[PDB]
Amino acid sequence: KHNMKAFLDELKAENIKKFLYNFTQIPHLAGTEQNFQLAKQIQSQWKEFGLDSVELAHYDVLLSYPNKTHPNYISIINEDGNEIFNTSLFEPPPPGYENVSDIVPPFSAFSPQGMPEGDLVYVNYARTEDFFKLERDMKINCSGKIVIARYGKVFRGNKVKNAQLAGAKGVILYSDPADYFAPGVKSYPDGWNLPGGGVQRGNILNLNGAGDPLTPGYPANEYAYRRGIAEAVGLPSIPVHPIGYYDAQKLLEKMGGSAPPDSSWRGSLKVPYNVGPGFTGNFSTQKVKMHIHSTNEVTRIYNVIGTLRGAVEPDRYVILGGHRDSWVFGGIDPQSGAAVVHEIVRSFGTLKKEGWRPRRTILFASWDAEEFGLLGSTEWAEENSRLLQERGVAYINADSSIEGNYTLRVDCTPLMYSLVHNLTKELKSPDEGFEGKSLYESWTKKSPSPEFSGMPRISKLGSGNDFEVFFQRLGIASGRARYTKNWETNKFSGYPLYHSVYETYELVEKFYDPMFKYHLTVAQVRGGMVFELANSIVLPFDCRDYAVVLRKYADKIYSISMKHPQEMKTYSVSFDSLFSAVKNFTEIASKFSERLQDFSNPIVLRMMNDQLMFLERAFIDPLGLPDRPFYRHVIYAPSSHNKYAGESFPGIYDALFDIESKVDPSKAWGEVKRQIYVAAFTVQAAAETLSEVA
Amino acid sequence: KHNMKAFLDELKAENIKKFLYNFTQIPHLAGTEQNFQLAKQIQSQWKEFGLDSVELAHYDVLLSYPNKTHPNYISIINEDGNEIFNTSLFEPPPPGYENVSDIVPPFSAFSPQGMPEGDLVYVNYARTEDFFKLERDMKINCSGKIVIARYGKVFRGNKVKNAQLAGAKGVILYSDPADYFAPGVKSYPDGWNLPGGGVQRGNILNLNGAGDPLTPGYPANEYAYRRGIAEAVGLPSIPVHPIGYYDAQKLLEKMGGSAPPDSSWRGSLKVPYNVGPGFTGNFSTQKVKMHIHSTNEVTRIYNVIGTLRGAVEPDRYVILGGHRDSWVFGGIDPQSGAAVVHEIVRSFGTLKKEGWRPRRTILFASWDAEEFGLLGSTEWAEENSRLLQERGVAYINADSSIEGNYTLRVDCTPLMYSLVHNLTKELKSPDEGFEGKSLYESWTKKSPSPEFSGMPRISKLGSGNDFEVFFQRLGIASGRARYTKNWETNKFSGYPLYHSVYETYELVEKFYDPMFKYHLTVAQVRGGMVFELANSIVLPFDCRDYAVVLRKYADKIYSISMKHPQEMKTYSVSFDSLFSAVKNFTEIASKFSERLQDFSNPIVLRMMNDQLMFLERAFIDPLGLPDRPFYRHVIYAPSSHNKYAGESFPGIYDALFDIESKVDPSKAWGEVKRQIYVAAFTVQAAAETLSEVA
């Protein structure tokens, strides 16, 4: 028999291990020859594995690279202009790789060039609330200062945007051991912690979904018209550079001015964590000087796109996608995900060679340039948006399969909650102590739902990965799953060796998943999801689960507004329309579910499958959110303060945020009311797609 | 048998006559009680005729009405401020209606209030090229002048926009006999010509597809957030008022300054047609003074929406829509169309009572407030956009059925050209001299295609009617057909009694169509189209006809650019990508057509029907055209100089228009190149929707 069990049993931990080793021997930086060679290898193997067609889709996009003959670094500079301390020019390479070439040194991709010199201000994690505390409570002015900020908590591009709007002239990002050194574990090569010479690479763009900075809205193909650099989307205006904690210690130890306002501002280094501006009396005349010489360059990137044509509904696409480009060796990020995808393709191809085809078409993608802003997935989606709009059932992402070894982590649309619960009840837990128990059971025990007893936690989708264009721009039901750690407050900060040269095959094989059983479990969850989506006769979406969360989000946004009762009285701010819409959605979704269970008629079925597929689509507003035209979903958007986190009712949330500080309250509350109207209208309109059609 | 012949034979001229009489006894101005009563009557009759459901959909939109106790008028005012001549306060009512109440006097809907006084400038038809001639060649300055312009050639809202941008302080529109008095025919009541006291009403908005000025993007429902008046879309900033040619003669006869630049500026009145500014020497101190006191008011409007549920594909909608609101009695506009729709509903309902149902769902609509800017159709489409986007097959409009008695006039998407040719070959011509000949034969003889021998003329869709939101915003295949005159250069000017009190049942019954045979022919064309769209197993669209016109439009826009060869050399302006895309579209459409003819499989059929239905949809760009976000179709938009006319490749056309006058040619040509990229990309993307799906 060719059923899900057949598919799942064909998946092998040993194959995932072999592929991970194969993908992590050399760096695969986007836009380099090594990454094009790997693209061609994947294309060849996917063909051999049995896919119907496998093509490369290429685009020419803006990328950013250090200057190989003019290195980036930071100095402390004395009175006469002597550089008395310099940060490192590279991370000490790990054992056995000290002769690997083409390791890109640490840098902040898309930083402009410059050599700003000035006094430091320490800004904690450079969050919106950190800058509020500095400016509003401590009365510290960042204008013309170099800001130094620890990585963690929020996406680094939000830190840089926040520093820019505070008037900083440069930003120094560093990894504090408080956030990147787990107590009781040794530094790499002897454990999974970050060494003091380790540094986290990463882009610092604020693209808000646009894709290639030069071609927002349209694919960066051969004849594309490109914006000039000055009109490009999302580029920072001040130099930025990341460093390790040995270097950070040197920059922070001399800091003077005000003490940290409280303990949540102190990391684990043996320094005071003074906010400054500048150094204590004796060194008051020393300054910090950045030297940044990276260049932005239009460069070709390559996505691999494989197709397994559906036997019954070939014009319905279920997509499994994840990226292939890495900062250096990509031992976790992305190759632990890419190896999982490779073994999924292999398993589907085995069934296919025995005569099976899925009901719907499955597209597999190896995206390029994810690390430079989701560029490959986004340009491809821009090129194919009409096909995806009218045919896309679902998108399952497949970046890193592991960031820990504790339990499952799933973020998805409410439409997939039931599918995930059901699938996980049928899979074996890989966890010690849960042998012979289901994955659902271990996951629910280790990660309890905050709302419901006997259910696991499933989070909203944010952004910072390749599902963004499919979900937030195009309104295609999306999900992601991986194995994760038990470190709640580190949820968005990365595992310690994130985007460092130390993220290697050996890291994974020695410290994370020596038996590749967590990888295998993730392959079963991602592959199982794709299988059910592509093969179930009725699409495995439950609209009633959206109704439940919509009520939760409506209660939440109302509660935020109700912190301002006088203003809601003055400006007649009512949430009645939104609750009415949610109530109607709940009622109509209940009735639709009855019909779906109560309906041999392929037209009624497909009519109903189209209602299910277009339901996520109905939450899209073609006008986008305010000043973010590529974030079009009215229920979910990446937080304006942290791209990694999702926000619900984002248009109303942003209208309410810090509203007590707005100069014209009439205008500000008017915009809250506008956003309430838009949300109520969109929820009612989405509900009406589930009504009987005629 | 229940086939198209059965449907067509049930249609009766005598019924169309009865309904036209019934709909034209009293005025039905949008937002008045009389128009709500007619809505309720139609709703009741459509129920009795057999439709499955018939509901009213209401909205509260910005409308505009004169002040009943403070009348609008224009004066010539002497030196001391004595008003020595006043324009009329109303049109002399026609015989037997001199005691009808609630006839709205002539006014320009949405005019602001004001009493500007100044010197006149005569601006011909107030077209872009008329203002070019005045300002650039004659060096006449309109700043602070009252402009007087004859109606005709272009939509009146474009005239007002052009006057506003010339710096006019008011606009006077009038009907010249050159454009509204056909030689050899008598004035109304004794013929179909405009009397000198007759005046054409009409709105002067520039909404560019937005719908209700206060709620762009969203339906004007009960909880809608409305823009304040100062941020409303499309409102004119200077007072405007229309008058008849008896009054115009009085204003024009004294005109001094420069002579008309040439004869195309002279109408048929016994005046010099001097451009001025101001009056000849003796009257040099007299001025013209407007008195406008109309008010804009949010007012409820009502659409009637009837549904005939499809037997096989109930989730596919074929829509027949036209408006019900009239300026006064609406004898031609809209009731000659509404009576046709009423008899179509009756015929479909007769078949239905005998057990028949169409394959797909047919929606019938009686729209409100068309005269105030397409408000009813647009608000409804805003409310239902997700259903229409994913389910709308086609929209057939049904405003006035006749504007003459000479031959057929059809404007539609290329996807419907074959359907129209085939249907008209099967219908009888109503024309004298063509008895026993097909409508195709008479139409082709009287209105030859300019490209093809043995084919009739079919024009592009522009705007100025209720199909605009469906076609240009949402990308639903649309068409319209009516009987028309033989008066080429009057194509966009209206029949003489257009929007006047003289447009009555008697006008039609005596002078246009005494036997109602032209009405019947139009009912057969509109109803026949709806029947085939709603009942053909394969949708009756031919994609190859789009390929042919795309090549024609590409040649045309290239030819415009090639008037500037030096600039195309300097800025490397290439149309190669656009011709490549058109070539690919032609190739793929040829292959798709072969498969469509060469393919018992309902999934393949419907897959292919979805490819056909979504092909018009593929020409939509979600980002819209520059500064016109609601005009989203890349191939067709209403001309920026004349809303009634369609423009092809509008984004490139507007980038090229008057480019030799732009201050920064580098920037201007860069935008031409951008628009070429967008067009080539969109044509290629639409082509790819016709490729095999997987």
Ligand SMILES: *[C@@H]1O[C@H](CO)[C@@H](O[C@@H]2O[C@H](CO)[C@@H](O[C@@H]3O[C@H](CO)[C@@H](O)[C@H](O[C@H]4O[C@H](CO)[C@@H](O)[C@H](O)[C@@H]4O)[C@@H]3O)[C@H](O)[C@H]2NC(C)=O)[C@H](O)[C@H]1NC(C)=O
């Ligand atoms: C949730 O679904 C329900 C349907 O089950 C839907 O109910 C609709 O509510 C609207 C808005 O309240 C109703 O609108 C009314 O319609 C009547 C005519 O049917 C009008 O006369 C009413 O207008 C009068 O009253 C208003 C309020 O006092 C005045 O402001 C106005 O000036 C008029 O005097 C009003 O327009 C509509 O009838 C129902 N439809 C039903 C019950 O079928 C509700 O809107 C949905 N929620 C959302 C957010 O869409």
Ligand SMILES: *[C@@H]1O[C@H](CO)[C@@H](O[C@@H]2O[C@H](CO)[C@@H](O[C@@H]3O[C@H](CO)[C@@H](O)[C@H](O[C@H]4O[C@H](CO)[C@@H](O)[C@H](O)[C@@H]4O)[C@@H]3O)[C@H](O)[C@H]2NC(C)=O)[C@H](O)[C@H]1NC(C)=O
């Ligand atoms: C119409 O359909 C045809 C397909 O039948 C489609 O043809 C495609 O054209 C593009 C653009 O010309 C081709 O792109 C090339 O792809 C190759 C790899 O396949 C690249 O090496 C090429 O890049 C090199 O050459 C460029 C031009 O000199 C350089 O600028 C560049 O730096 C590189 O050196 C180039 O990207 C593509 O291969 C074909 N695809 C085919 C034949 O299948 C055409 O684009 C369609 N028209 C439109 C408007 O879409």
Ligand SMILES: *[C@@H]1O[C@H](CO)[C@@H](O[C@@H]2O[C@H](CO)[C@@H](O[C@@H]3O[C@H](CO)[C@@H](O)[C@H](O)[C@@H]3O)[C@H](O)[C@H]2NC(C)=O)[C@H](O)[C@H]1NC(C)=O
């Ligand atoms: C996750 O698994 C659950 C448990 O199997 C699925 O819910 C179950 O779905 C079946 C099929 O619809 C339901 O059976 C139906 O019951 C009604 C009787 O009320 C009958 O009319 C139908 O003919 C059919 O037998 C069953 O009730 C339901 N169980 C529940 C809700 O507790 C669920 O669909 C799965 N989710 C997926 C596949 O996305």
Ligand SMILES: *[C@@H]1O[C@H](CO)[C@@H](O[C@@H]2O[C@H](CO)[C@@H](O[C@@H]3O[C@H](CO)[C@@H](O)[C@H](O)[C@@H]3O)[C@H](O)[C@H]2NC(C)=O)[C@H](O)[C@H]1NC(C)=O
């Ligand atoms: C308008 O009417 C014309 C003339 O009838 C229609 O074109 C004709 O359509 C039929 C049905 O597809 C074609 O017949 C097919 O011919 C091929 C043989 O090459 C065969 O493989 C198929 O099985 C089928 O018999 C016919 O060739 C074609 N005639 C033409 C193009 O001259 C046209 O479809 C109508 N347009 C509509 C309905 O929108």
Ligand SMILES: *[C@@H]1O[C@H](CO)[C@@H](O[C@@H]2O[C@H](CO)[C@@H](O)[C@H](O)[C@H]2NC(C)=O)[C@H](O)[C@H]1NC(C)=O
């Ligand atoms: C990763 O595995 C691939 C595929 O097995 C290896 O590429 C093959 O290498 C052999 C020996 O050079 C060649 O004969 C084949 O042509 C290659 N196949 C391809 C590219 O499809 C590759 O060597 C492995 N890489 C590493 C680092 O082990």
Ligand SMILES: *[C@@H]1O[C@H](CO)[C@@H](O[C@@H]2O[C@H](CO)[C@@H](O)[C@H](O)[C@H]2NC(C)=O)[C@H](O)[C@H]1NC(C)=O
């Ligand atoms: C930090 O690096 C800088 C740059 O290489 C060093 O300063 C240079 O030293 C060389 C050789 O002594 C001089 O010729 C250059 O003029 C200096 N360049 C600049 C820009 O100052 C500096 O010595 C290093 N500091 C430490 C402590 O190692």
Ligand SMILES: *[C@@H]1O[C@H](CO)[C@@H](O[C@@H]2O[C@H](CO)[C@@H](O)[C@H](O)[C@H]2NC(C)=O)[C@H](O)[C@H]1NC(C)=O
């Ligand atoms: C237009 O026709 C309608 C329908 O025949 C007429 O309305 C009907 O009038 C009679 C007599 O008053 C009533 O008994 C019915 O209730 C009406 N039916 C409706 C409204 O559905 C209407 O009188 C006609 N109007 C004119 C001007 O002739």
Ligand SMILES: *[C@@H]1O[C@H](CO)[C@@H](O[C@@H]2O[C@H](CO)[C@@H](O)[C@H](O)[C@H]2NC(C)=O)[C@H](O)[C@H]1NC(C)=O
């Ligand atoms: C044009 O109409 C105006 C407005 O009604 C007339 O002027 C008014 O005449 C009355 C009565 O004689 C005066 O009391 C008002 O003061 C005048 N109003 C204004 C605003 O001027 C005028 O007489 C009419 N002109 C002609 C030629 O009929």
Ligand SMILES: O=C(O)CC[C@H](NC(=O)N[C@@H](CSCc1ccc(F)cc1)C(=O)O)C(=O)O
């Ligand atoms: O440019 C972008 O939007 C993201 C590019 C690149 N994305 C990325 O590294 N994503 C990593 C983020 S690590 C933090 C995180 C965030 C959300 C989550 F569910 C799990 C982990 C990932 O999703 O696995 C980056 O964050 O630098």
Ligand SMILES: O=C(O)CC[C@H](NC(=O)N[C@@H](CSCc1ccc(F)cc1)C(=O)O)C(=O)O
């Ligand atoms: O507000 C608008 O966009 C149009 C409202 C109203 N529309 C209208 O009268 N349309 C009439 C326009 S008469 C000129 C014309 C234009 C195009 C055409 F095919 C036939 C006639 C119609 O289409 O029958 C108007 O023009 O004032």
Ligand SMILES: *[C@@H]1O[C@H](CO)[C@@H](O)[C@H](O)[C@H]1NC(C)=O
């Ligand atoms: C890299 O280093 C120096 C800095 O000016 C120079 O030789 C070369 O132009 C640089 N390369 C760039 C800017 O890509």
Ligand SMILES: *[C@@H]1O[C@H](CO)[C@@H](O)[C@H](O)[C@H]1NC(C)=O
């Ligand atoms: C911050 O500092 C700069 C110093 O030049 C000044 O221009 C700016 O106004 C200051 N802002 C505040 C809030 O003190």
Ligand SMILES: *[C@@H]1O[C@H](CO)[C@@H](O)[C@H](O)[C@H]1NC(C)=O
């Ligand atoms: C794997 O699990 C064990 C047991 O809880 C833990 O001690 C170890 O640190 C984990 N490895 C990683 C990388 O989290």
Ligand SMILES: *[C@@H]1O[C@H](CO)[C@@H](O)[C@H](O)[C@H]1NC(C)=O
């Ligand atoms: C109509 O006429 C006069 C003008 O001021 C006044 O009595 C009334 O306010 C007006 N009605 C309006 C402005 O709707």
Ligand SMILES: *[C@@H]1O[C@H](CO)[C@@H](O)[C@H](O)[C@H]1NC(C)=O
């Ligand atoms: C037109 O006339 C007004 C008169 O005040 C003036 O402001 C404007 O600059 C003039 N424009 C031209 C082109 O003469």
Ligand SMILES: *[C@@H]1O[C@H](CO)[C@@H](O)[C@H](O)[C@H]1NC(C)=O
């Ligand atoms: C109807 O047709 C006749 C014959 O051509 C023509 O003389 C008459 O003017 C037409 N009526 C109208 C309103 O066009």
